[PDB]
Amino acid sequence: AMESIGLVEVNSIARGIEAADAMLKAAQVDLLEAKPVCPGKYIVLICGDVAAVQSSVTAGKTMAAHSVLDDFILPNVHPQVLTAISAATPLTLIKALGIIETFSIASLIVAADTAAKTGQVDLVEIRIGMGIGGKSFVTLTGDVASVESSVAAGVMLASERGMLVDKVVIPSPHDHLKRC
Amino acid sequence: AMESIGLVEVNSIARGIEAADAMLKAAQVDLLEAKPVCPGKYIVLICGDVAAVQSSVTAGKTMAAHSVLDDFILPNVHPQVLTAISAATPLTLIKALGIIETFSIASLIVAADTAAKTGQVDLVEIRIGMGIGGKSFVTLTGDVASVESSVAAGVMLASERGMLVDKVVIPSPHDHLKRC
Amino acid sequence: AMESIGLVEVNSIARGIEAADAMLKAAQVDLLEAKPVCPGKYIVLICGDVAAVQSSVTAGKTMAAHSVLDDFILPNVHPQVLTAISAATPLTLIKALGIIETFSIASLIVAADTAAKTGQVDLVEIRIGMGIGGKSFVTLTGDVASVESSVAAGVMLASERGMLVDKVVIPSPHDHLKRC
Amino acid sequence: AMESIGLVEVNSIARGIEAADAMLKAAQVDLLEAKPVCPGKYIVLICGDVAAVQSSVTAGKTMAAHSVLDDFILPNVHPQVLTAISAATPLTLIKALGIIETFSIASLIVAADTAAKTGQVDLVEIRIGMGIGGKSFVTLTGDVASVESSVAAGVMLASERGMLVDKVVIPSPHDHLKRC
Amino acid sequence: AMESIGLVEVNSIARGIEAADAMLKAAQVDLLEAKPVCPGKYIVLICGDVAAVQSSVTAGKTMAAHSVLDDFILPNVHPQVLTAISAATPLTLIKALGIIETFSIASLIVAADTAAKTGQVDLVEIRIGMGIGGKSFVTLTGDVASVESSVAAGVMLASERGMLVDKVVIPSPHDHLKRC
Amino acid sequence: AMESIGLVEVNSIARGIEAADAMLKAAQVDLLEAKPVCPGKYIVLICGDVAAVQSSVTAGKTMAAHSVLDDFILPNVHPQVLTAISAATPLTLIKALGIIETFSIASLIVAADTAAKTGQVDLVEIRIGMGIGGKSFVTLTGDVASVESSVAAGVMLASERGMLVDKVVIPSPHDHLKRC
């Protein structure tokens, strides 16, 4: 089995911190992200096995109750999505550069995961948050054809749901773009 | 005599900086905080004796005039409120964890001060600001009963005025919550 | 010839990054600033010769298309505006302190440039952005008369266009204002 | 009773971390500082009551054994020494500026404490460490006569023991020195 | 096949940067670390397949020539050693805490790798460098018996070669040690 | 006239801070750098007109007396040396990459200045200090021939005086070297 990712979005820092406590305790899950985002959201991201993430997410929904804004689970998430989120992808020689930008963290996770699952790309970074808009984004590289079809796929779902801000493929990025 | 705390909130950075200059000059007061908060507020927090804080606050209200959004004074403020604000509370062994979160800096000061004044807690941190919402919060620890009755008291006033976002008491915080 | 400054404001990070790539490639220009500002804008600032900046700005407008929020060019910009923007003005003994604060980056550039062009002041800093409001500001020093007439001039244009938040001249700034 | 301060210096990070664990557990003491300093020292600073600090220091000496380089205790330490060490002295209007610089952390604590105990000064900062030399220093302000006699006293002990690097009193510090 | 790790230590920043350039170019390897350490060393750490790391290391030794201080290769390195080095191990619930500290980066890599290979521990962090001494260290957690036998094994080789500074197992770390 | 650069190196932080105060006061000079470097040096770098820098340097030598380790003045310094030192060179497209590394800050200034004065290069950065060794370095770019003859010239003087650690010209730097 591959791991799952779970997300709870909460209206309060206070409640978000209590929800995070519940989520960590509920089952064997690792914390990826617990932080205040755009006003005045608090988000919790965790990863573990399918069933472990499901208990953890229910636990947080239980504690947070009416201040839950969103909860989401993506089973069989691509390993690179997790490392990217945890600001931990190794230095990658960037070739062609793709960027997907969505209105919600859930749609971003879906897009990043779909992107990574198609062909030969490496995710470069994921930005949940980040002060503010609520806009999140993923960047990736590979040869131009690989990147092109990876962002087109990464975008299919998000666009249908009106969650997609925009995307770009930049084939030969200027060096002040590799000066990330 | 115990010290007082004074707050001026201003619509401009420019005016806020001029107001802060007036406030520092007006009387023997110390500056706790002078910073831009949520759009596009500038806040000034100062502390000194009752009468000194009163002159300082009037001075700022004088300079800032129509771009004042709020001015506030809390006499006989608990020493821990001040150290907490000035990001200066020593490392405290966190036992049970209480958090109060309010819509305004004034209501937060009142809540933190009332919390500290009731029983045996230590305030852990205060966050004015902080990008954004305008939401502020206080965290504190102690044994569970002490914390429970300290946040209930800290909350009484704020809730009546519709300034209270929320609160939590977490009796046995997970270690990734002591990883503050 | 003195250099020009060009600005493109874009609705997406993704598009903003693609626009920046186009702008750098279009002609011999230097990048001053490329960054996400208030929700969910991305801004690009560049400098070079008149004609070089014009090509660069058209290039970005070309790539960014309907997600352009603003594009602007200021020819014969004062050298101090550029160094101030690039967070690079040397330590300056601050005498009298002037601050201009505007609702748009364009109006700020105009105001800073007009300020620097009048009499004997040194710009101290420029803040584009900066989380959030969209409010930008310039600070400058000199003797009191020089600063007074430099901000009055720096403000003329901005005020007529309803782009001016406010300004202050502080003749003898308190030392916790020289503690910038 | 006023509080005491205790210091253990250890040859290893590993041992220093174990010593710190012992020290925190030994008695009701607060941790001020636990950090690697010049090669390859680890230092622990704690504060509490006389007897509590004595148990804590013995505990660390017990765990650290032959990798102890120095242990020290200063009873009835001036409250300002503690706040200064914990990087927590409020913004202070600096008038005349005194600086004492010693070869050892112990001699610095003694000097800072003696300085604070004489007349009307406020300690501004203490730097243990700090990469490297092993040199530590204290800065303080007040009127010129107060500062002059406070550093002369702060220096008496240190100089006799050949632990004193040097000191200065700067009566009217340039503003780029108040730009601390 | 599992990956290998290669290290080149160079006497100059200048030469170290040239060596790093050679190493990256020589074969498909990823850069883990390229940085100045204690005076005036520059270190390069890379990872890839056995043969790729061997070419990369020879390349750096070629460019750096007489300013090479050390070169080292560890085949079949434990995946956790790499993630730990690249400051990228996820938040781990620390139980019992082990620390190994050595005089050389090579001996540290060997010790960390041997530690991770024995029983059920998770490496928490690795510190190459770090200003200064040249001392490096690894921390790990698990239950007490697992950690005890993992550091004893991690230490065997290093101690025989006089490269071992020291080690500790702390069974129940104080919470200000989980405040890492 | 072009500006000069002056350097005073002092044995104490305390004395170095007093020397810096004297230097700033002595004449119309700007402060470039005032900071503790390798154990336990404090360095002051200033720039202004020839005669102004000469007064400033004599002033510091006067205050610092026997704790002066070095004083130096370089007349008609290249504008790029100053901007490079003040961490303020704009983003430069790096082509071929040259690096000069010397044992003393004086020899570095001389080398950087000679480098910039020969042909068409742009200095990229200067690192005085920097923890530790006392080793300083300059990086520059241009086409390969320009860089080659600029570092050869930049090195002539330093090598004769045994102050030169080393240099490199890297014609096609790997992208993780443009990831500066």
d(CA F155, CA F110): 9
Q: Rg of chain D's alpha carbons, rounded to an integer?
A: 16
- For the four alpha carbons of C151, C152, C153 and C158, in that order, the dihedral sign comes to positive
Contacts of residue F59, defined as CB under 8 A and 6 or more positions apart, other chains included, come to: F19, F22, F23, F25, F26, F27
- The upper half-sphere exposure of residue E67, i.e. CA atoms within 13 Å in the direction of its Cβ, equals 21
C90 touches chain D (CB under 8 A): no
d(CA B102, CA B111): 9
Q: Bridge-partner residues for C35, per DSSP?
A: C43
Contact E128, E117 (CB under 8 A): no
Contact D26, D55 (CB under 8 A): yes
d(CA C127, CA C137): 5
Q: Is B9 helix (H, G, I), strand (E, B) or coil?
A: strand
Contact B44, B11 (CB under 8 A): no
Nearest to residue F142, comparing CAs of F110, F175, F94, F178? F94
Q: How close E18 gets to chain F, by Cα (Å)? A: 7
Question: In the sheet where C29-36 sits, what is the strand order?
Answer: C29-36, C42-48, C4-10, C68-74
* Distances, alpha carbon C82 to alpha carbons B155, C30, C119, F94, in Å: 50, 11, 18, 21
What DSSP element (H or E) covers A46? strand A42-48
Contact B63, B15 (CB under 8 A): yes
d(CA A85, CA A65): 26
- For the four alpha carbons of F57, F58, F62 and F67, in that order, the dihedral sign comes to positive
- Tokens in use for F59? 């002033």
- Give, rounded to a whole angstrom, the gap between the first and last alpha carbons of chain B: 34
Contact E172, D16 (CB under 8 A): no
Q: How close B164 gets to chain D, by Cα (Å)? A: 29
Sole residue written with tokens 């004609």? C51
d(CA B3, CA B80): 11
d(CA B121, CA B111): 13
- The upper half-sphere exposure of residue B28, i.e. CA atoms within 13 Å in the direction of its Cβ, equals 2
Q: DSSP alpha helices (H): ranges in chain A?
A: 13-25, 50-64, 79-85, 105-117, 144-160, 175-178
A31 touches chain E (CB under 8 A): yes
Q: CB–CB of E179 and B175 under 8 A?
A: no
Contacts of residue E73, defined as CB under 8 A and 6 or more positions apart, other chains included, come to: E4, E5, E6, E7, E53, E54, E57
Nearest to residue F76, comparing CAs of F102, F44, F114, F105? F114
Sole residue written with tokens 């115990």? B2
- Tokens in use for D59? 């505990």
Contact B16, B24 (CB under 8 A): no
- Give, rounded to a whole angstrom, the gap between the first and last alpha carbons of chain A: 34
- E strands, F75-135, in order: 96-102, 122-127
d(CA D34, CA A127): 33
E21 burial level (CB within 10 Å; 0-12, 13-18, 19+): buried
- Give, rounded to a whole angstrom, the gap between the first and last alpha carbons of chain E: 34
Q: CB–CB of E135 and D40 under 8 A?
A: yes
Contact F23, F57 (CB under 8 A): yes
- The upper half-sphere exposure of residue A145, i.e. CA atoms within 13 Å in the direction of its Cβ, equals 1
Residue B65 one-letter amino acid: A
Nearest to residue D17, comparing CAs of E98, E155, E149? E98
F101 → closest Cβ in E12, E38, E39: E12
F165 touches chain E (CB under 8 A): yes
Q: CB–CB of D86 and B83 under 8 A?
A: no
D128: left (phi over 0), alpha (psi -120 to 50) or beta: beta
d(CA A80, CA A68): 27
**Which technique was used to obtain these atomic coordinates?**
X-ray
Cα angle value C35/C39/C45 (rounded, 5°): 30
Q: Structure resolution in Å?
A: 2.7
D 111-150 residues with CB below 8 A of E? 131-132
D173 touches chain C (CB under 8 A): no
- For the four alpha carbons of D70, D74, D75 and D80, in that order, the dihedral sign comes to negative
Q: CB–CB of B91 and E178 under 8 A?
A: no
E120 burial level (CB within 10 Å; 0-12, 13-18, 19+): exposed
* B122-127 vs B136-142, strand pairing mode: antiparallel
Contact D8, D60 (CB under 8 A): yes
B162 burial level (CB within 10 Å; 0-12, 13-18, 19+): exposed
d(CA F65, CA F14): 13
Q: Bridge-partner residues for C168, per DSSP?
A: C99
Full DSSP string of D68-114: EEEEEEESS--HHHHHHHTT-PPP----EEEEEEESSHHHHHHHHHH
Question: What number of other Cβ atoms are within 10 A of residue F8's Cβ?
Answer: 30
Say whether the peptide bond before residue E130 is cis (omega within 30 degrees of 0): yes
Full DSSP string of C76-145: S--HHHHHHHTT-PPP----EEEEEEESSHHHHHHHHHHHHHSSS-EEEEEE--TTTTT-EEEEEEESHH
Q: DSSP alpha helices (H): ranges in chain E?
A: 13-25, 50-64, 79-85, 105-117, 144-160, 175-178
Contact C44, C23 (CB under 8 A): yes
* All structural domains of chain F: 1-79 (3.30.70.1710), 80-180 (3.30.70.1710)
Residue C156 one-letter amino acid: M
d(CA F176, CA E20): 9
Nearest to residue C21, comparing CAs of C51, C82, C49, C62? C62
- For the four alpha carbons of F76, F81, F87 and F91, in that order, the dihedral sign comes to positive
d(CA A135, CA A158): 13
Q: Which residues of chain C make contact with F88, given a CB cutoff of 8 A?
A: 83, 86, 88
C96 burial level (CB within 10 Å; 0-12, 13-18, 19+): buried
Sole residue written with tokens 């493929």? A169
Residue of C nearest to F31 (CA): C91
d(CA D57, CA F16): 35
d(CA D49, CA D71): 17
Query: Would you give the DSSP letter of residue E91?
Result: P
Length of chain E, in residues: 180
Q: CB–CB of E178 and B175 under 8 A?
A: yes
* D122-127 vs D68-74, strand pairing mode: unpaired
Residue F146 one-letter amino acid: S
Residue of F nearest to D139 (CA): F14
d(CA E158, CA E135): 13
Q: CB–CB of B88 and D91 under 8 A?
A: no
- Give, rounded to a whole angstrom, the gap between the first and last alpha carbons of chain C: 34
Question: What number of other Cβ atoms are within 10 A of residue B22's Cβ?
Answer: 21
d(CA E66, CA F12): 36
What DSSP element (H or E) covers D175? helix D175-178
d(CA C8, CA D125): 45
Cα angle value E109/E114/E119 (rounded, 5°): 140
Longest dimension (CA), chain D: 48
Cα angle value C26/C29/C35 (rounded, 5°): 90
Length of chain B, in residues: 180
A142: left (phi over 0), alpha (psi -120 to 50) or beta: left
Helix axes E13-25, E50-64, angle to 10 degrees: 140
Q: CB–CB of A86 and E86 under 8 A?
A: no
Say whether the peptide bond before residue B132 is cis (omega within 30 degrees of 0): yes
E1 burial level (CB within 10 Å; 0-12, 13-18, 19+): exposed
- Tokens in use for D8? 């253990």
- Give, rounded to a whole angstrom, the gap between the first and last alpha carbons of chain D: 34
d(CA A74, CA A5): 5
d(CA B133, CA B37): 9
Question: What number of other Cβ atoms are within 10 A of residue D159's Cβ?
Answer: 15
Burial A11-27 (b: 16+ CB within 10 A, else e): bbbbbbbbbbbbbbebb
Sole residue written with tokens 């980056």? C105
- Tokens in use for E45? 């750490």
Contacts of residue A50, defined as CB under 8 A and 6 or more positions apart, other chains included, come to: A1, A4, A75
Nearest to residue E46, comparing CAs of E7, E86, E2? E7
d(CA F68, CA F61): 7
Sole residue written with tokens 């470039």? F32
Contacts of residue E86, defined as CB under 8 A and 6 or more positions apart, other chains included, come to: A88, A90, E32, E33
Question: In the sheet where B136-142 sits, what is the strand order?
Answer: B122-127, B136-142, B96-102, B164-170
d(CA F147, CA F95): 9
Burial A125-151 (b: 16+ CB within 10 A, else e): bbbbbebbbbbbbbbbbbebebbbbbb
E32 touches chain A (CB under 8 A): yes
Question: What number of other Cβ atoms are within 10 A of residue A2's Cβ?
Answer: 10
- Tokens in use for C64? 């960014």
What DSSP element (H or E) covers B64? helix B50-64
Helix axes C50-64, C13-25, angle to 10 degrees: 140
C32 touches chain F (CB under 8 A): yes
Q: Bridge-partner residues for A73, per DSSP?
A: A6
Chain E with chain F: Cβ pairs closer than 8 A: 53
Contact A19, A58 (CB under 8 A): no
C166 burial level (CB within 10 Å; 0-12, 13-18, 19+): buried
Q: CB–CB of C174 and B40 under 8 A?
A: no
Q: Rg of chain E's alpha carbons, rounded to an integer?
A: 16
d(CA F91, CA F65): 41
Sole residue written with tokens 């790093």? E20
Phi and psi (nearest 5°) for E72?
A: -155, 145
What DSSP element (H or E) covers F20? helix F13-25
Chain-centre distance for alpha carbon E144: 23
Nearest to residue F103, comparing CAs of C6, C79, E114, E13? E13
Chain-centre distance for alpha carbon E147: 18
Q: Which residues of chain F make contact with C83, given a CB cutoff of 8 A?
A: 88
Q: Which of C3, C44, C45, C93 to mutate to test the interface with F (most CBs of F within 10 A)?
A: C93
Phi and psi (nearest 5°) for A110?
A: -55, -45
F162 burial level (CB within 10 Å; 0-12, 13-18, 19+): exposed
Sole residue written with tokens 């040249």? E134
Nearest to residue B109, comparing CAs of B4, B1, B2? B4
Nearest to residue C167, comparing CAs of A144, D142, B12, E84? B12
* Distances, alpha carbon B170 to alpha carbons A40, B94, B174, C114, in Å: 20, 11, 9, 56
- Tokens in use for F148? 């080659």
Full DSSP string of A11-45: S-HHHHHHHHHHHHHSSSEEEEEEEE-STT-EEEE
Q: Bridge-partner residues for C107, per DSSP?
A: none
Contact A135, C40 (CB under 8 A): yes
D176 touches chain C (CB under 8 A): yes
d(CA B58, CA B70): 12
Residue D80 one-letter amino acid: Q
Contact D96, D143 (CB under 8 A): yes
What DSSP element (H or E) covers D145? helix D144-160
For chain F, how many helices (H) and strands (E)? 6, 8
Contact A57, E117 (CB under 8 A): no
What DSSP element (H or E) covers F165? strand F164-170
Longest dimension (CA), chain E: 48
Contacts of residue E74, defined as CB under 8 A and 6 or more positions apart, other chains included, come to: E4, E5, E109, E110, E113
Nearest to residue A54, comparing CAs of A81, A15, A26? A26
What DSSP element (H or E) covers F79? helix F79-85
What DSSP element (H or E) covers B73? strand B68-74
d(CA B141, CA B122): 6
